[PDB]
Design a protein around this nucleic acid. Sequence first.
RNA 1: GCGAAGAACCUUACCUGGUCUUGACAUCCACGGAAGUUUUCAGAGAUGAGAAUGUGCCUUCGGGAACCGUGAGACAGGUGCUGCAUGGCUGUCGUCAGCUCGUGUUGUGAAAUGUUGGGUUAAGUCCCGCAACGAGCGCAACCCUUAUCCUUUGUUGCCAGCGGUCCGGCCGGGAACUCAAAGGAGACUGCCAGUGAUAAACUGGAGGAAGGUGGGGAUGACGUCAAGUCAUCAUGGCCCUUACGACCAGGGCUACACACGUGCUACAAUGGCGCAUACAAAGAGAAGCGACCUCGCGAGAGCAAGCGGACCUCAUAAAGUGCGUCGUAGUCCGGAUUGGAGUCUGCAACUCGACUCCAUGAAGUCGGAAUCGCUAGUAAUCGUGGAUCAGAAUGCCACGGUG
RNA 2: ACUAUGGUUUUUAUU
Lengths: 150, 127, 98, 206, 100
Amino acid sequence: RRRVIGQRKILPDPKFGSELLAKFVNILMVDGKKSTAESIVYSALETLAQRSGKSELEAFEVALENVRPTVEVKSRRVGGSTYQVPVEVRPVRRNALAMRWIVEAARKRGDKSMALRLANELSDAAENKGTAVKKREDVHRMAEANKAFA
Amino acid sequence: NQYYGTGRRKSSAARVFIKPGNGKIVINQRSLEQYFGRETARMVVRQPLELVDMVEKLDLYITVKGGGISGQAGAIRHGITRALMEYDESLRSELRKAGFVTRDARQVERKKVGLRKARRRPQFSKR
Amino acid sequence: RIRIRLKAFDHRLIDQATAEIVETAKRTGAQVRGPIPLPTRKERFTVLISPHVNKDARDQYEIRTHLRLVDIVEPTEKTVDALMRLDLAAGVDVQISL
Amino acid sequence: GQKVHPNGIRLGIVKPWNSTWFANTKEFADNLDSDFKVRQYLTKELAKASVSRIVIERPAKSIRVTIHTARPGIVIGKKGEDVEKLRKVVADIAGVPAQINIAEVRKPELDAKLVADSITSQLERRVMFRRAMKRAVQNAMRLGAKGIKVEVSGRLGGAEIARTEWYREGRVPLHTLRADIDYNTSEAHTTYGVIGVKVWIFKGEI
Amino acid sequence: AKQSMKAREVKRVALADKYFAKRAELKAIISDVNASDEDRWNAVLKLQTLPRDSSPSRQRNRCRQTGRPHGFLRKFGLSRIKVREAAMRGEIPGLKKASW
RNA sequence: GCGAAGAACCUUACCUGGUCUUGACAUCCACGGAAGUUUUCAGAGAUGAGAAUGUGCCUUCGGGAACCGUGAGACAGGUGCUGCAUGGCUGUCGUCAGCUCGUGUUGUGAAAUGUUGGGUUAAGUCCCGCAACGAGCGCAACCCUUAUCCUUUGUUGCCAGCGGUCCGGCCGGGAACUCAAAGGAGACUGCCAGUGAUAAACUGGAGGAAGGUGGGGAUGACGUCAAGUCAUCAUGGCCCUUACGACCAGGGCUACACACGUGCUACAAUGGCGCAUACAAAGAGAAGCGACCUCGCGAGAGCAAGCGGACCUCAUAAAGUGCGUCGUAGUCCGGAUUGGAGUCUGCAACUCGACUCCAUGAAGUCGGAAUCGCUAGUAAUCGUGGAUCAGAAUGCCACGGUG
RNA sequence: ACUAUGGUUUUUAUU
């Protein structure tokens, strides 16, 4: 329906003053145990502090700056046929897209603590050096190249 | 001269008192950093306080009882807003900007027939 | 030297029965206080709405149990005598104790 | 679908509950059983006595019962001793000393028990039910009330259907809770069908 | 449900008040605590539990109207098979339609 | 996980063998007995027979009524049959905006028009137009529930300045906040500009605790399968009656080379374990809730503080926080299974019950084709309580924390 | 794009 959100407001991180670090713990946490996620955020930043050339205060933002697309491909029905169309990636999602991919990667991993599973993906999330890892972005590379019918 | 405000949330209730001129920060006969707001919600009572701040311009005194400590915090936040929105006539514009003047009454949804654990139709994880 | 009790379920009968007891207690005692309260309780329960199967269809019932300590100013021998024969309709419950 | 009960919605508000007595959960079902044992006793001895209701009390270490009838003089007799043969029995069913009391019913032409009896006395003469129920309510509305309904249910002769036949005048009413609504079902037990007669009467809102 | 079920409590419930709710708290008259590995009480206590049907167990309230055991609810005073018809007649004090 | 919320003898119907039959149960009439209590002998018991105690209620002294039995003439009994004999009760679309009358017209009439058509709305609600005008049932509102302020109500509840002190809101002081309760007022498109066959009403802004039925509940129009059920009931009929009836007792309703129907706890380290540590809501309870200590390996037994259930018990809420510790190993773990000991309740736990201890010891590291569900205190997730109950739930109904 | 099929019989008119 129509008379719906939008985006509900969230309160920014009390220690860092950031709304990205507030959304990050909300999607990172599991079974609503946000208190454990508050021990994983910044604890996963241990090996990134000196390695960040934007300084520590952008050592996580850098992994979200790596990917900021304008369109994504979707496969949608027009009748008895189903075709690939480009849909807009708005400012509200443009900064939260890669954040959602990094937590999935860490949850799908199974070695060390969670604060080390998260650090494995975050170490390469602005380097992209691994094999078959940029297949992640084919859903936006196929969108900046959509032809469809007009 | 003293300013007063009240707030209630989830079986808890708070009373807040403020004096002009820099001084103490008291809650339940202890300091505001002495036992309260150490868990998962922490800074909820300080959300409106950041618009004036502690050890800066006022003397603060709180009394709170009932329920759990996060319900207490969401009650204190309204009670301190009610006091601060008469402490200065241009501070109130900023409390209605941050939306701390709005009174929350969300509580929980009530059950109906035929439903399960407070909510939801008799359930099947498959088919 | 005794103390009193009144217990009910009806929100008006509790006061109508109070107005019987504090008057029976005033007819032989001139000093007054008026009634004291406590404890009030509530209770709710559910039942199946039909006698045969139909177990997904249900109805909601509740009660509210009202109690007063009432208090008596002079519980004198002549005043408790009037309370040994206390009537007072059916629909409420009382005690006398020392 | 599901229907709200026109009587059950108003119990305790101007229309009283049929019994009054306090009991705790350890004996509530045991007091109520004595309360039903006396109903099925008294209403089967008083089967032809113009009785519309009975009202039960528990006075101090006792029981008390009021009988509401349109014809009290043959129920209390001449006077107060014709009831002992029932009093000695309800006092044993209740396990406490008993009192029997009398009440006179108002407007039998305007009461849901007695207007139904005024339709049963036409069905005893095997007439068509439709005119019979209409006449009994037309006699009632010309005397009082602010709205009346009558309905007949089941095996009516009649048709091969689940539908009733009915007649209504005036207000139901819906949401007035001071409406003191009077209601009854009486089964006619005819040669070829049990035939339920259902009546609803509304008289005022106070 | 059978007409035999209506009086099945009559002896059972009477001995529940008489013995079956205090005999263990008063057991010190049919017991000894001074003789080691010695019995002089078991056969007289087994003689006390020799009778049947009346037990601390086997005890059910039932629907005295029908004999039906299942669907009893003490908070309603009546078994649910008759609750709506009794509560819409106004027969059960103080049950009414008011919902949630 | 439905009706069968706790299927030991019970509940309870099935199978088997006993004990008996105008019936375990109803009612009319007569007749022998008070109602009752206790115990011996035979039987496991239903049943078969003695020895002893009591003689109530009642009165024309003629005898009698409850009540317990025995029996005749009438009749009963049945989880037997009959949802194609009948009531009473019952799905669901959907809480959709429609169902249905009188008069006029129109048609040969059934009927149609009306209520359709244009917009607005949650709406047959309103606006526009008008061969139709009005109306009942439904819609709305009522009822009901939540936020703000004032007024009202205060003990075994509460406490802001301040004396006295069962050192305690305990007494003086207060009636206000909380906590539990009631009654009002406030939100009305009110206000501006914009849009709208410029109209219904919408689109933003201010101001407010709240804005557009404020929000949330209660409510099932006509119609839907003439639904499921005589297994709660009655109630017409049929069949059995020397029984298909009911009183005991023993097996069964948790047979099984295999299928369906759903949950909970884990398979782990955003997790567990051991030791600390922060904070509850709602209920239970004197033949009770039970604080402690002692015996012991332990359940528990034995005694027992406080308390009459608003200054006690049930009761270190737990998860969370934090420290110590650990891995990709079917694990520190788990302890599912199998004997032996016991502990409790109870004719009785062998079989089908729970709790405990020394020992032993397996499964679980995403999981079939294929597919499931809602929009925020919602999903997700952890503890607390109650019901049933002689004696157990993980199911049933509720409570709060993290979110 | 493709995606077929479902026997016969089985309701309401009251005096």
